[PDB]
Every structure is written in C-alpha cells, then in structure tokens.
Design a protein around this ligand. Sequence first.
Ligand SMILES: Cc1cn([C@H]2C[C@H](O)[C@@H](COP(=O)(O)OP(=O)(O)Oc3ccccc3)O2)c(=O)[nH]c1=O
Ligand SMILES: Cc1cn([C@H]2C[C@H](O)[C@@H](COP(=O)(O)OP(=O)(O)Oc3ccccc3)O2)c(=O)[nH]c1=O
Ligand SMILES: Nc1ncnc2c1ncn2[C@@H]1O[C@H](CSCC[C@H](N)C(=O)O)[C@@H](O)[C@H]1O
Ligand SMILES: Nc1ncnc2c1ncn2[C@@H]1O[C@H](CSCC[C@H](N)C(=O)O)[C@@H](O)[C@H]1O
Lengths: 237, 237
Amino acid sequence: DFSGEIAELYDLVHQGKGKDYHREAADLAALVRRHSPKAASLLDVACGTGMHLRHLADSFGTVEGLELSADMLAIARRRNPDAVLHHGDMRDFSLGRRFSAVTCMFSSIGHLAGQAELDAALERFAAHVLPDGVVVVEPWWFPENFTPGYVAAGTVEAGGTTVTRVSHSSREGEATRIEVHYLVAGPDRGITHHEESHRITLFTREQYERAFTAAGLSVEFMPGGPSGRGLFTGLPG
Amino acid sequence: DFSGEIAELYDLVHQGKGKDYHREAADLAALVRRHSPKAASLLDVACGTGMHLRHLADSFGTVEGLELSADMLAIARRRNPDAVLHHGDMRDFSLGRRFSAVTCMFSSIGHLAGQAELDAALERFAAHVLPDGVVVVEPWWFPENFTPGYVAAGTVEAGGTTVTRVSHSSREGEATRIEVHYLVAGPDRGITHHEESHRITLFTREQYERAFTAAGLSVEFMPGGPSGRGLFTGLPG
Ligand SMILES: Cc1cn([C@H]2C[C@H](O)[C@@H](COP(=O)(O)OP(=O)(O)Oc3ccccc3)O2)c(=O)[nH]c1=O
Ligand SMILES: Cc1cn([C@H]2C[C@H](O)[C@@H](COP(=O)(O)OP(=O)(O)Oc3ccccc3)O2)c(=O)[nH]c1=O
Ligand SMILES: Nc1ncnc2c1ncn2[C@@H]1O[C@H](CSCC[C@H](N)C(=O)O)[C@@H](O)[C@H]1O
Ligand SMILES: Nc1ncnc2c1ncn2[C@@H]1O[C@H](CSCC[C@H](N)C(=O)O)[C@@H](O)[C@H]1O
C-alpha cells in the first residue's frame, strides 16, 4: 500500500530522482494524438498523486483518474481540483463512459498478482477506450531484464525537510521484493524512520501480450520508454 | 557508547565527511615540535579507531593510545599493530610514564559530564605530559556557538556497501543531544537501520580554562581548528 508518509513523500522522492512528469505527459499526449487525431479525453489508471494528469489536463479537455489508495488520491485531487478522480480498483471498475486513451504508468500494473488479474485489468482498459483510441501500459521489468541485488540511495531537501531514501530489490519467486527505507529529518522534527515493502510481479513480455490480445487489443512493445522498462500500446480491433 | 555497528561504520562515515586525519596529524606533530623540539612520544587519549595515531607514528618513535570503548580500541589495535594501545578511562588512568604530548581530539572531552570530570581528566593529562611538552584538547562547541536544530546528511559507498547517515542536534539543558540514524545497504545484506544518541556537554570556554589551570597548565585557545571548534593547548608550569 501507499498510505500515510509513503504517500506524503512520494512526489518529493521522485522529484529528487529526476522523474520528469511534464516531459512524460507531453510524450504521452503526442502518442495518443498520433493514433487518435481528434482525441479529447484520457483516463489515467493507478494515477497515484496525479502528476501526469496535471500536465495532461493542459492538452485534453477531459482527464479523469482511477486510484485505489485514498491517501494517494487525496493528493491527486488537490493537485487536480477541476478533474473527476475516482476511487477504485483497476481490476474491476466501471465508469460508464469511454476515453480516447486509457493509461497505466510507472509499472503500477506490476501490483497485479498473476495472469487472471492482468487479463481482468486489460479487459477493463479495453472496456473504457474508444475505437480509434489507445491503451498504454508501462510494464514492470521482464524477468530476463530484472537486476537482483540492486540498491538505490538518494537524498533530497525541501522546505527544511531532508529525506533520504534507500531501496533494495531481490527476486522472490515470480516477483521482485522491493524494500524501501526512509530517514526524514528536520530542525524541529528530529529524525524519523519509515519502511515499506512491495511485491511487484515479474510478468513476461508474452504474458502482457496475452492480456492485451484477450481484451481485443492489438499490442506493440517499444523498448526504453520513460523508465527503461519500455512501453506497451494497444489498439482496439 | 561506540560499540557494534557504530564502531564498524565510524571510519567510513568520517571518510565520506572528508575528515583528513593525515593532515590533522601532520599539523599536530608540527604543533608538538614547536613547543618540544626533541619530542619523541605522544599519548592520544580517547583515540577511537586510531586514525590520528597511525599517522603520528610516522613522526614519533613512541605513540600510545587510551580508549574506553573495547570495540573502537579493537579497530585501533588492528590499524596500529606495533603500538601499545591501552584500555581505560580518561577520567582516571595511570600509565606510569610521561609523553611529549597528550592529545584528546575531535571533542571527545565533551563526553565528560561536568566540571569535576573535566578537571579530573585535565589533571590526568598533566600527570602524563613532560615539562617541555604540550597537552592538546579539541573542545566541543561553546554554548554561544552551538547551532540547535542542525541536520547533517550524507551517503558513502565502499566495497559494495552503501551507508547513509543523518544526524540531528538539539539543546538539552547544559548539553547537546545528538541523534544519529544510519541505513546500511548492500546487494546481499538488504537494508538495516541503526540508531544512536549522545549527550555532549556544552562546557563554556571559561570551564575549559579552569580545568587546565587547576591541572597546573597554562592555557591558550586557537579558533578554527580541525573542526571549526578551535583547539586548546596547555603547557606545564
Ligand atoms: C536499471 C535496472 C533497474 N532495475 C530495477 C531494480 C529496482 O527494482 C528498480 C530501480 O529501483 P528504484 O530506482 O528504487 O525504483 P523506482 O524508480 O521504481 O522507485 C520505486 C520502486 C518501488 C516502489 C516505489 C518506488 O529497477 C532492473 O530490474 N533492471 C535494470 O536494468
Ligand atoms: C557548523 C556548526 C555545527 N555545529 C554542531 C551541530 C552538530 O552537532 C555538529 C555537526 O554535526 P555532524 O556533522 O553530524 O557532527 P560530527 O562531525 O561531530 O559527527 C558526529 C557527531 C556526533 C557523534 C559522532 C559523530 O556540530 C554547531 O554547534 N555550530 C556550528 O557552527
Ligand atoms: N488494483 C489497483 N487499482 C488501482 N490502483 C492501484 C492498484 N494497485 C496499485 N495501485 C496504485 O498504483 C500506484 C503505483 S505508483 C505509480 C503512480 C503513478 N502512475 C505515477 O506514475 O507516479 C499507486 O498509486 C497504487 O496505489
Ligand atoms: N571517559 C572516556 N575515556 C576514554 N575514551 C572515552 C571516554 N568517553 C568517551 N571516549 C571515547 O571518545 C571517543 C569519541 S569519538 C573521537 C575519536 C578520535 N579521537 C577521533 O578523532 O576520531 C570514542 O572513541 C569514545 O569511546
């Protein structure tokens, strides 16, 4: 989960890591318009703190979000006060309308547990996309590209708070176990320690392809992508 | 205390902070020889991991140490295998010989609790110095120069281990409370968290001067010094 301090620290952590949501959103908007020139709407699934949405709103007249963490969604709603952002689950939701694009960014799809959940999410994405539109999924690493033992450490400061974050990634069966620790310090705060752990599924490329195909989407993989993990696109029909 | 992982991390932490024990030792050796041209021996009290001693041994035919932490002293003895390094307490020890210089570096004197302990340590230092020699004490901050709320953060890597350290300093009556947290990570280790807390006494300049005088030493303060905290010297007579 992504609650409490995890959620409150998320944007600062990713700013310090140099994640450029503005450039990623401009790239996404152009990718959508490449397939759907008249595209006017976008649904960002697992939208987190709504960073992509805030920039995509400059480009699309209607942007909406779906997010299962209330604490992440609270930050997203503050950031996007004029947008409709829904609380719910990517495996089984129904908004009653379709969008030019359905996006699921930054490997959020890896929080699904196996093939049945992956297939269910892709079917929901196809159920919410228009016929000339596009479904965009940024996968987690494939098993052959996963680096067990990886350690990342960084420190960022803002507003008088210093945040140090360290992550460690290992292989646990068919998933990555990521452990993340934080030290959060400030002149009055003192030092507090926080920890979190995620299990992120190592779906193969073929497993993603199967989920897209079973949802009625034609699937393409582009290597590299916003995070080194590539990007899948899918078109209905 | 300075046991376990605190001791094992100490040198790497201070290397990453840029502490230059080689230059500090060359400066100390020249300071001693300025007062005692024929100086041939030095005792480093609260010698920690023996970094100063290792360099001072290149300059003085006899160097010895005194240290109360067995874990710090174990590292010092490995680093200085040909030197006699004593286990004991700066407030009350007796080596049965005197030295050209008695040094106490990097604010170790701030681990003493009040005037009686400070006076007792300075008397022991004077009891171990030769008549043309010098006692050198690097103080902690004086109250007027202490910065409450100070946060320091740094990360260093060596040998496959990543160490992040954060400290926070506050005023607690007549002492600084320093809280220190570490995250120590590696590909097999995973991530471990450690914490420590010290109370370091905020002696005034006059209190140091009184301790030197009561030990029979004439005292001089030089601002700046190896750590910004200045340096006291004292000469017998
Ligand atoms: C080059 C490289 C990295 N990784 C893995 C190793 C590690 O699992 C991840 C990089 O670690 P971190 O930078 O902390 O990850 P995020 O940016 O996603 O931050 C969060 C991670 C988890 C929860 C929340 C945020 O990619 C690989 O598997 N292969 C690679 O070639
Ligand atoms: C400029 C400045 C700093 N400090 C205080 C604030 C803080 O108490 C200290 C600087 O913090 P850190 O760099 O972690 O200290 P060390 O290098 O001694 O490492 C250890 C500290 C304690 C135990 C072990 C190691 O000096 C002041 O009081 N005045 C100042 O002008
Ligand atoms: N079943 C599910 N349904 C909806 N959101 C989910 C979910 N499982 C995980 N999430 C959300 O997936 C997100 C992963 S972090 C990625 C957030 C965002 N897309 C960004 O690029 O920053 C979290 O916000 C988490 O709460
Ligand atoms: N009463 C006492 N007697 C001897 N050593 C003491 C002591 N109280 C604290 N110490 C030692 O004081 C040291 C402080 S850290 C400074 C170590 C060393 N002089 C250096 O410059 O790196 C620790 O090694 C601690 O164990």
